[PDB]
Amino acid sequence: STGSATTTPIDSLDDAYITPVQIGTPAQTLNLDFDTGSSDLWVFSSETTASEVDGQTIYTPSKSTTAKLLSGATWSISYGDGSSSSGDVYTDTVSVGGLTVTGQAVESAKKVSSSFTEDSTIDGLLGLAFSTLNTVSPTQQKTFFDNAKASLDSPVFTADLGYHAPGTYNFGFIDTTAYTGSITYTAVSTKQGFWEWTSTGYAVGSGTFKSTSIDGIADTGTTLLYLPATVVSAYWAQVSGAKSSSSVGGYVFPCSATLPSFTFGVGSARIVIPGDYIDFGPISTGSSSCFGGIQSSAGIGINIFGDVALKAAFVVFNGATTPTLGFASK
Structure with missing residues (x-):
């Protein structure tokens, strides 16, 4: 079926x-x-x-x-x-x-x-x-x-x-018509009950790719992308006027700013999140301050590849005896 x-x-x-x-x-x-x-x-x-x-x-x-x-x-x-x-x-x-x-x-x-x-x-x-x-x-x-x-x-x-x-x-x-290129599969740990995997690194905009292991979960029920503070700081440093606001509860940026893309690694493959995906609009109606879609995971205890990341890909949740995750561009 x-x-x-x-x-x-x-x-x-x-x-x-x-x-x-x-x-x-x-x-x-x-x-x-x-x-x-x-x-x-x-x-x-x-x-x-x-x-x-x-x-x-x-x-x-x-x-x-x-x-x-x-x-x-x-x-x-x-x-x-x-x-x-x-x-x-x-x-x-x-x-x-x-x-x-x-x-x-x-x-x-x-x-x-x-x-x-x-x-x-x-x-x-x-x-x-x-x-x-x-x-x-x-x-x-x-x-x-x-x-x-x-x-x-x-x-x-x-x-x-x-x-x-x-x-x-x-x-x-x-559905092989639903994505471009190939699907890259990557290992899953089920020990915490999540679709937990390790990204191979990241890039900000046209920047060079940083090879570094980022453990996290593929979570369709979380809206945003939550990553280590170092990664998130590197991203928002490339956005003019962006700042981390304790009163708002994360990074905000002026809606007049251009957002760079964010690339994350899946094995040797790369998923590119377009900048527009990272804009979650005014912090309050009529505000010129916009809420960022990439935020720090510090204090969550885990990194979360939420919808911001997943919607840039075709994602396979493989529930074979040894589960794995697959990602393709689309």
């Missing part, structure tokens, strides 16, 4: 991407944030505290003939931005782009933090990291990809995120 679904930016800045997902029988379609940095599929639901729902589409398991309570199961998750959610668990039929999993754990939110309530466009998350990070207790649950894997033509999914435009998540096949 295979599946193929379009993923769409939630706003004009690509702050996140939503993908439609069919849950239950008859289908209830919710727009989920596909997140290769976590491993829970959770949704706004008929069980979510009423005051914490504001515009989202909810899953109502009582209206699904295939929903079954996963008796005794609870879940609770916190994300790197300080947001959180928790609740109980059903199993149900879940389809993505024509690919169907029966018996998928669908984690129903009883509580969500304000960040989730305030974002009307995201109805929940669909985790695509390794199932060892899944928070369901007492019985850890598998991700949608883990459950689908054996049925797939090939044990892979691919992320092809758009810049200010829709893109594609494919399951079970590599």
